[PDB]
């Protein structure tokens, strides 16, 4: 019978509480790059962006890859439900960061796609994260997202 253990719930508030700290790291590395700060070169923003996808990647996988996760299905509703959510939530995250980037590097495949995907950006990301909070707090996981 699968079920979201006391280490899971553990291991899911850590690693979103590192996850919203990467994306927080990004942004700053984004707008100094933008701004074309002295130190902040596109070398330097590819380089850092880089890191912090792949670990973003990680703390994404750890949490899709627990047991309950990834047998979501057949466990409570409300995991279930995180499942989906945290998916879609932690996918159009990083998707947006890897564009962001791409752009700064003059590439725009990947805007296309990403309007394509994501047709109402705005709407989409005030309503993943609103079923996120309540995903979590259902969950009994006390994580306030940083949105």
């Known amino acids: 019978r699968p079920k979201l253990s006391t280490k899971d719930l553990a291991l899911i508030k850590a690693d979103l509480a590192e996850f ?61 439900a995180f499942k989906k959510i945290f998916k879609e939530w932690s996918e159009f995250k990083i998707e947006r960061i890897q564009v962001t980037i791409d752009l700064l590097n003059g590439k725009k495949d990947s805007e ?22 309540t995903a979590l707090n259902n969950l009994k996981v006390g994580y306030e997202l940083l949105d």
Not at 112 to 133: D, E, G, H, W
């Open 20 to 80: 919203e700290a990467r994306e927080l790291s990004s942004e700053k590395i984004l707008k100094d790059t933008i701004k074309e700060e002295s130190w902040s070169d596109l070398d330097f923003a590819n380089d850092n962006i880089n890191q912090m996808i792949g670990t973003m990647k990680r703390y994404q996988q750890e949490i899709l890859s627990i047991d309950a996760i990834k047998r979501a299905s057949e466990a409570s509703a409300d995991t279930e």
């Open 112 to 133: 296309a796609v990403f309007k394509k995907t994501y047709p109402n950006q705005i709407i989409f990301k005030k309503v993943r994260t609103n079923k996120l909070q």
